[PDB]
Amino acid sequence: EFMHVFDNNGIELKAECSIGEEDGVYGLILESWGPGDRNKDYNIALDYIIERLVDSGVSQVVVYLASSSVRKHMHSLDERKIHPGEYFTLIGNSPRDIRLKMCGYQAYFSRTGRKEIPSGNRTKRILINVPGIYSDSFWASIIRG
DNA sequence: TCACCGGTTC
DNA sequence: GAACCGGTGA
């Protein structure tokens, strides 16, 4: 029932995902890491996603916090956008460093709202959008490798 | 039961 | 500061 991200050798990572419309936004949803080994390749899978997006000519994305808790308590889609600007930038650093910047923003959320000081888990359920892309074929290529 | 993220371990 | 564990409330 869940799709997965595949590594550069075509091996399936422990990283559940799905492609579709959620809260009016079309994109890739990467499921959360935890407990234990549930989706433990979150970070590697997300590194590949960023790298492959860049190789496909995508320089900017929009990333929403999409955990059941945050969706429940933060009704505003604009507030659920993890980064302060309109877009998040995928170029100018290594895919790893870009991920660190991206996932640092997840630390500003709690169960019920935003925080002052970022803390806690950074590997939560997120929705990545590429502006102008409404196609599962594109996203299929990105997660397949 | 399950995905949630707080909080400890790296 | 980031990776990971596992306790938690629904």
Side-chain angles (χ1 to χ4, degrees), chain A residues 92-112:
Chain A
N93 283 120
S94 60
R96 193 197 132 79
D97 292 312
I98 295 289
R99 171 184 65 78
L100 293 172
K101 198 177 186 297
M102 185 190 283
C103 293
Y105 292 121
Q106 297 185 43
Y108 287 87
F109 292 82
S110 72
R111 283 188 162 76
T112 58

Side-chain angles (χ1 to χ4, degrees), chain A residues 45-57:
Chain A
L46 184 50
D47 287 338
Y48 286 128
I49 288 158
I50 294 161
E51 189 187 359
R52 295 161 183 177
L53 282 161
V54 171
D55 291 353
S56 306

Side-chain angles (χ1 to χ4, degrees), chain A residues 36-89:
Chain A
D37 290 344
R38 181 179 158 274
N39 299 310
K40 68 159 181 66
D41 299 320
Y42 186 102
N43 292 331
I44 320 177
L46 184 50
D47 287 338
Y48 286 128
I49 288 158
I50 294 161
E51 189 187 359
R52 295 161 183 177
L53 282 161
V54 171
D55 291 353
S56 306
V58 180
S59 66
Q60 287 185 312
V61 293
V62 192
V63 185
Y64 301 93
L65 211 301
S67 66
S68 64
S69 293
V70 170
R71 288 191 66 255
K72 180 184 182 174
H73 294 106
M74 294 177 64
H75 289 226
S76 177
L77 187 70
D78 193 64
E79 291 187 15
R80 281 185 262 141
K81 182 170 59 51
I82 66 172
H83 49 84
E86 189 173 354
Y87 307 104
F88 181 78
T89 299

